[PDB]
Amino acid sequence: TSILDIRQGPKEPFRDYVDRFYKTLRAEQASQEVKNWMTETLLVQNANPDCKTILKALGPGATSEEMMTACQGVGGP
């Protein structure tokens, strides 16, 4: 029951990982600002190597939709 426990598997679809991250962060005790910062930092930090590369190359200005689509070619079902 901690956001720190959320790390993308090497074969895990990025969409599945973000889903787990989001649901866990909803339940986490934190201010909205801290949750925003957690998302801006941990989500990319804890992504698998290839998704992490894509996300960083996209940059912090990327939207959720773009982000999901940009990573959908990595990993398995």
């Binding site: 925003n36 957690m38 801006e40 959720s64």
Partner: peptide, 12 residues
């Protein structure tokens, strides 16, 4: 993205 972006994407 932020948590608010995720809220917007998924809804409740």
């Amino acid at each position: 993205i932020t948590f608010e972006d995720l809220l917007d994407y998924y809804g409740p």
